[PDB]
C-alpha cells in the first residue's frame, strides 16, 4: 500500500549483524523495497559461515562480512543504498544520535551482551527494535517499543574444576583456564601438571575416600605405549604429543579462539590428558571444539524463516499496526493446535524492570566496575552510562549476588 511503500522508500534502517540472520534479512529488506540500509558487523568471513550466509563465497574468506554483503547485494540490485560498517555496534560512536536516524533497528546478533546494549540504545533513541534469535531448528522474533512493550531485559565451582572433576566439561573448562594461565618447555609443564599436581592432589586424603582417585602420568612412560578425521579419538601418546606440539607452536597476551588450530589443539590435548587421569574416556577434537567453543549448530532454513518474519513484523510497525505485531516462535514440530509457528500478543513493560523502568534501582550484597556494573548489568562505558542514556541505582547490602 502507498503509505507503507513510501515509508519503506523514505526511511533509513539499521541491521546489527551480517551473519546467518543478517544476510537473509539484508536480502529480504532490499527485495521488499527498503531503499536505505545501514549494516554493521565486526567480523570477517570464515569457511564455516558458508553453509548459511549466502552473500559470501569461498573467495571472500577473510574479508569483512558487512562489506561483502553489500557488494553481493549490489550485484543483483545496483541501486540499493547500503552503508556497511566493519565495526562493533558497541563502539561509542554509535550513540543515541546515530540510532535516532533510523525508523527501525533489527538485531541479527549471536549473544545476549550485544543485544542488551542495542536494547538500551533503542529505548534511549525511541526507535522500535525487532529482536530475533535462532539455534539449530528453533528460533523466534519479537518487537520492542519503548512505552509500549516489554524491553529485552524485562524478564562450575573452582573445587569441581581444580580438585574433583567428574564430567568431560570440567576437564575442558580446566584446559581453558590452563591456556589463559600460560598464555592469557613441554616436558616440564607436562609432568608438573599431569604428574606432580595430581600427586599434590592425592595429598588431600579426605577427597578420595568416596570417589575414584586420579592416576598420575609420567611423560617417558606415556611415550612408551567411522566419521571425519576430527571425530576420531586418539590414544594417550597422541594427545601427550599434541600437547607438546601445540605448546611449541604457541610460544613462537593471547586470547583463546576455537579457530586457532594450535590453541584448539592445546585445549583438546590438555583436557584429554586430564580426562584420562580421572578415569574418563577421552573426547574427539570435534566434540571438544563444540564444548570449548560453545558452538551453536546452525543451518540456512531456520535463519531464512526468521529473517522473513522479521521483515513482516517491520512492515506492521511501519504501517502503524504495532498492535498487530507478535512474538513468534518457530517450532520443529507443531503444537497441539497444529501450530508450527506460534504467534503471541506483545507484553507491556514490566514495572519492575532494572533497565527500562522510570527510575531503576537494584540491590547487591575494579571487581565492581568489571564483574558487576559491566558484566552483570551490561554497561559498556560506565551508576551512569551516558552512551546508553541509562542510570541505575545500586543499593549495597560466590563473590557477590543480586537479590
Amino acid at each position: 500500500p502507498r503509505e507503507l511503500a513510501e515509508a519503506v522508500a523514505g526511511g533509513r534502517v539499521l541491521v546489527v549483524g551480517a551473519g546467518g540472520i543478517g544476510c537473509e534479512l539484508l536480502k529480504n529488506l532490499v527485495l521488499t523495497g527498503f531503499s536505505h540500509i545501514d549494516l554493521i558487523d565486526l567480523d570477517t568471513i570464515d569457511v564455516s559461515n558458508l553453509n548459511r550466509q549466502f552473500l559470501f563465497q569461498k573467495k571472500h574468506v577473510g574479508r569483512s562480512k558487512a562489506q561483502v554483503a553489500k557488494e553481493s547485494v549490489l550485484q543483483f540490485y545496483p541501486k540499493a543504498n547500503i552503508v556497511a560498517y566493519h565495526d562493533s555496534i558497541m563502539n561509542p560512536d554509535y550513540n543515541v544520535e546515530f540510532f535516532r536516524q533510523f525508523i527501525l533497528v533489527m538485531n541479527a546478533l549471536d549473544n545476549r551482551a550485544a543485544r542488551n546494549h542495542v536494547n538500551r540504545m533503542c529505548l534511549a533513541a525511541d526507535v522500535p527494535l525487532i529482536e530475533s534469535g535462532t539455534a539449530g531448528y528453533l528460533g523466534q522474533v519479537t518487537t520492542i517499543k519503548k512505552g509500549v512493550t516489554e524491553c529485552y531485559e524485562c524478564h562450575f565451582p573452582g573445587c569441581t574444576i581444580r580438585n574433583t572433576p567428574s564430567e568431560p566439561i570440567h576437564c575442558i573448562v580446566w584446559a581453558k583456564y590452563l591456556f589463559n594461565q600460560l598464555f592469557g618447555d613441554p616436558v616440564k609443564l607436562f609432568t608438573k601438571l599431569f604428574k606432580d599436581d595430581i600427586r599434590y592432589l592425592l595429598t588431600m586424603d579426605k577427597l578420595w575416600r568416596k570417589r575414584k582417585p586420579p592416576v598420575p602420568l609420567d611423560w617417558a612412560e606415556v611415550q612408551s605405549q567411522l566419521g571425519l578425521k576430527d571425530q576420531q579419538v586418539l590414544d594417550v601418546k597422541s594427545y601427550a604429543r599434541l600437547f607438546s606440539k601445540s605448546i611449541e607452536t604457541l610460544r613462537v597476551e593471547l586470547i583463546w579462539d576455537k579457530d586457532d588450530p594450535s590453541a584448539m589443539d592445546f585445549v583438546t590435548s590438555a583436557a584429554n590428558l586430564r580426562m584420562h587421569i580421572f578415569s574418563m574416556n577421552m573426547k574427539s577434537r570435534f566434540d571438544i571444539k563444540s564444548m570449548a567453543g560453545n558452538i551453536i549448530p546452525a543451518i540456512a532454513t531456520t535463519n531464512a524463516v526468521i529473517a522473513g518474519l522479521i521483515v513482516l513484523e517491520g512492515l506492521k510497525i511501519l504501517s502503524g499496526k504495532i498492535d498487530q505485531c507478535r512474538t513468534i516462535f518457530l517450532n520443529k514440530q507443531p503444537n497441539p493446535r497444529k501450530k508450527l509457528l506460534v504467534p503471541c500478543a506483545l507484553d507491556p513493560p514490566n514495572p519492575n524492570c532494572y533497565v527500562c523502568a522510570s527510575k531503576p534501582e537494584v540491590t547487591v550484597r575494579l571487581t565492581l566496575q568489571d564483574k558487576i556494573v559491566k558484566e552483570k548489568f551490561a554497561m559498556v562505558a560506565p551508576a551512569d552510562d551516558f552512551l546508553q542514556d541509562y542510570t541505575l541505582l545500586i543499593n549495597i547490602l560466590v563473590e557477590f549476588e543480586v537479590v
Binding site: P78, A80, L312
Partner: protein
Amino acid sequence: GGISEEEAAQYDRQIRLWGLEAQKRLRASRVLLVGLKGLGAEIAKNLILAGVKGLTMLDHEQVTPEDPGAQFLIRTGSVGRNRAEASLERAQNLNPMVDVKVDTEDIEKKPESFFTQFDAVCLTCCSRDVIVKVDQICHKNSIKFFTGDVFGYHGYTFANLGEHEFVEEKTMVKKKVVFCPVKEALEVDWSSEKAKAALKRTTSDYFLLQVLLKFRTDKGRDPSSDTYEEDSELLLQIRNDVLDSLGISPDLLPEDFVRYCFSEMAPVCAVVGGILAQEIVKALSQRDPPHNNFFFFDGMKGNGIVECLGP
C-alpha cells in the same frame, strides 16, 4: 570419511545439527525444482547451501517486465532471458560442490522417464492438473514429491512421501509415516460428520488454496497487482462457486481476502522457501518426522499451521 576435508569444514555447523550420515545422504541426492520465481529462488538457495548432489532448475518461462526489479539470483536487466538460465550463475556460485543444472523445457512435455533421475521433485507455480500428474508419476517410481506456492501474505507447502521411514532422536528410533496422493489431499469430501468436525479446526488457508488453484486453471496465470481490480472481482466469484461447490459457506473465506493474496512478497518466499527446503532435506536424509501433509502460512497473523488432509 565419505566426504572431503573441504566439505567437512564448510558443512561443519550443520553436521553438528543433523550428523554426518544425514549429510552423506544429501550428498547422494538429486532434486528437481520447477519454477524459478520468488519461492523457487529461496528453495534453490537453501538446497544448494545444504549440499545436495545436484539441483536441476526447470522453468520454461522468460523474465518479464512485471517481474520484481530485485531478484537475488538474477541480474537486473534480464528481461527476456529464460528464468532458469538467468538464475544459474548466482545459484551455482552459492556452492560449487553442487551439480546445478538448468532445463528450459515445459514440465508438462516431460516424459515419465525424465523424473527417474531424481530423489525428490518440488513444483512451484504449477497448475493443479500438472501437480496431480507429476504426483502420479512420482508415486509409481517412489519419488519424494513436493509442491508449494506464495500469494501475497500467504503461502503453502505440500508433501507426498508415500510410505516414509525415518529416524528421530527420542538413541535413534526408526519410525514410519504414511502420506496420500495429492489428488485426495486437494479433493476432500466435507459431507461426513467426521469431515464436518474436522472443518471447524481446518485453517481457511486451505480454501484460499482451492480458490487460487482454480484462478490458475482458469486464467493461465496467478492474480497480479497490475490487474488488481479485474483479478479481485474474479477471485470473489471463484470464492462463491468453489465454496458453494463444497457445500461450505463462502463466508469461511472473508470477502477482503483479495487484499492479502496478490504478488510474490519476498519475506513470504523466505518463510515458505525455508520450511519447504527443510522438508526436502528431512525427506532426503530420512531424519526427523516430515509434516503430514500441508503447511499453510499467513504472514498477516504470523500463523504457520500443519494440516493432514486427504485420508
